[PDB]
Amino acid sequence: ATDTGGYAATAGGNVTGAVSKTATSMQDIVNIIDAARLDANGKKVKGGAYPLVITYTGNEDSLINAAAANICGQWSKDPRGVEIKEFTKGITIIGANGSSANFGIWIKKSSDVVVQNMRIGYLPGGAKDGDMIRVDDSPNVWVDHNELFAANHECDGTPDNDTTFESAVDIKGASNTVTVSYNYIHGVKKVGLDGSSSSDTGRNITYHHNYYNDVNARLPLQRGGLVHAYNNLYTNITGSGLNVRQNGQALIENNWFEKAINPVTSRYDGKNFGTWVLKGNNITKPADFSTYSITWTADTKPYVNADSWTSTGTFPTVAYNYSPVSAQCVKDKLPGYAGVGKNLATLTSTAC
Ligand SMILES: [Lu+3]
């Protein structure tokens, strides 16, 4: 249904008149989407001819396992990904239990796209924007119950010394409403951006019930707009957490932070700091920093850290209806709902 627990209101391909197809490989996904653009007469239709619910049964563990053993050999390879360009009829790509992919999903100028239960990791082509998931000029996208991973490590001699692997979920352009939920993101250096440049500001993103572990930064690197981060489990953050920039507003509530450096900050621009409303997290005052191993660092440019752990601004009325569970409940239960193979389960107060 349209309820995603966030700003995105979409059902993807699970609508009336949808056609279900099974993909056993990346190639099939491409061929299926391509066929879905032709009407009864064999003519193409703008935005697609009919809704789709593609179930991916392929498994590329062999590619993933070989990449994991040769981390530094991935960045120079050709990037692999299925591009969903200008398809608006509605599309849901569900990975079948047991499936895995060594290719990304790149959404471009589309709408109502749902990506669920996909295990994507160690993609090749980091030097050529090999993102695991990319949302560009695409409103109403829902990235739910996926496992996005790689190795939180940078190899030597990589272009820009930042391209060993690319991001987990990059959002940019007119991707006005998006919900990123129940994802198990681990071992990723650059998790994902929310705005590709200082000029690419806006969008309303909801990050909830995501379990991040062993990640370096960008949770997200927010550029303007609104970001509602609730019920996320943030552990072992090696660089920085939510980086609220270009005057962005964030509502950080009922989250669990632990072993994290600069969990909530605004840095790198040296100006136009974003704001945050802090409520109901495991941390309530600076006295809890030592309790949960929270450390802060400075930046060479003017920056703002939430080292006082107090709200620095306001946040509009959260449009959608949601009910956050307690920070303690996410810490105790979230790991069992986030990720693939959980049958798209959701954490409720009744399970606390
Ligand atoms: Lu990218």
DSSP line for 15-72: STT-EEEEESSHHHHHHHHHHTTB-TTS-B-TB-SS-EEEEE----HHHHHHHHHTGG
Q: Provide the edge-to-edge strand list for the sheet that holds 177-181.
A: 19-23, 52-56, 91-95, 113-116, 141-144, 177-181, 204-208, 226-230, 249-253, 275-279
Task: Note whether 147 and 121 are within 8 A (CB).
Answer: yes
Of the candidates 240, 250, 178, 248, which has an alpha carbon nearest to the alpha carbon of residue 212? 240
The Å distance, Cα 323 to ligand 1 centre, comes to 32
H or E element in which residue 93 lies: strand 91-95
The CA-atom distances, in angstroms, between 183 and each of 3, 101, 145 are 17, 15, 5
Superfamily of domain 1-352: Single-stranded right-handed beta-helix, Pectin lyase-like (2.160.20.10)
Task: Note whether 328 and 200 are within 8 A (CB).
Answer: no
Phi, psi of 179 (to 5 degrees): -125, 125
Task: Note whether 226 and 202 are within 8 A (CB).
Answer: no
Rg of the chain in Å (alpha carbons) = 20
The Å distance, Cα 170 to ligand 1 centre, comes to 6
- Retrieve residue 38's tokens: 């032709």
Burial letters 165-198, b for 16+ CB under 10 A, else e: bbbbbbbbbebbbbbbbbbbbbbbbbbbbbbeee
Would you call 129 exposed, middle or buried from its count of C-beta atoms within 10 A (0-12, 13-18, 19+)? middle
| CA 266/CA 112 separation, integer angstroms | 31
* Cis before 302 (ω within 30): no
Active site residue 218: yes
Phi, psi of 299 (to 5 degrees): -135, 155
State the alpha helices, DSSP H only, in the chain. 26-35, 61-69, 327-333
Contacts of 52 (CB under 8 A, 6+ apart): 13, 18, 19, 20, 21, 32, 33, 36, 89, 90, 91, 92
Task: Note whether 17 and 50 are within 8 A (CB).
Answer: yes
Task: Please state the length of the chain.
Answer: 352
CA angle at 60 for the pair 59 and 65, rounded to the nearest 5°? 130
The Å distance, Cα 333 to ligand 1 centre, comes to 31
Q: Which of 218, 223, 245, 267 is catalytic?
A: 218
Task: Note whether 75 and 158 are within 8 A (CB).
Answer: yes
Task: Note whether 8 and 144 are within 8 A (CB).
Answer: no
Would you call 72 exposed, middle or buried from its count of C-beta atoms within 10 A (0-12, 13-18, 19+)? middle
Domain boundaries, the chain: 1-352
The Å distance, Cα 129 to ligand 1 centre, comes to 5
- Retrieve residue 275's tokens: 């704001």
Of the candidates 34, 145, 10, which has an alpha carbon nearest to the alpha carbon of residue 84? 34
| CA 65/CA 1 separation, integer angstroms | 36
Task: Look at residue 329 and give its three-state secondary structure.
Answer: helix
Known binder of ligand: residue 86? Answer: no
Task: Note whether 205 and 229 are within 8 A (CB).
Answer: no
Which position has the token pair 């940019």? 172
| CA 261/CA 269 separation, integer angstroms | 19
DSSP single-letter state for residue 159: G
Which value, to the nearest 10 degrees, does the dihedral of the CA atoms of residues 283, 289, 290, 291 take? 10
CA angle at 100 for the pair 124 and 133, rounded to the nearest 5°? 55
| CA 10/CA 142 separation, integer angstroms | 7
Of the candidates 119, 115, 22, which has an alpha carbon nearest to the alpha carbon of residue 61? 119
Task: Look at residue 330 and give its three-state secondary structure.
Answer: helix
Task: Note whether 164 and 128 are within 8 A (CB).
Answer: no
Phi, psi of 296 (to 5 degrees): -125, 150
Known binder of ligand: residue 170? Answer: yes
- Retrieve residue 2's tokens: 């349209």
| CA 229/CA 252 separation, integer angstroms | 5
| CA 220/CA 193 separation, integer angstroms | 5
Q: Is 99 left (phi over 0), alpha (psi -120 to 50) or beta?
A: beta
The Å distance, Cα 28 to ligand 1 centre, comes to 24
Known binder of ligand: residue 131? Answer: yes
| CA 139/CA 33 separation, integer angstroms | 19
Task: Look at residue 350 and give its three-state secondary structure.
Answer: helix
Give bridge partners of residue 265 from the DSSP assignment. 243, 305
Of the candidates 295, 290, 279, 275, which has an alpha carbon nearest to the alpha carbon of residue 327? 279
Would you call 70 exposed, middle or buried from its count of C-beta atoms within 10 A (0-12, 13-18, 19+)? exposed
**From which experimental method does this structure derive?**
X-ray
Task: Note whether 90 and 52 are within 8 A (CB).
Answer: yes
| CA 132/CA 143 separation, integer angstroms | 11
Known binder of ligand: residue 34? Answer: no
Which position has the token pair 């996005």? 148
Give the strand pairing for 256-261 and 233-237: parallel
- The experimental resolution of this structure, in angstroms, equals 2.2
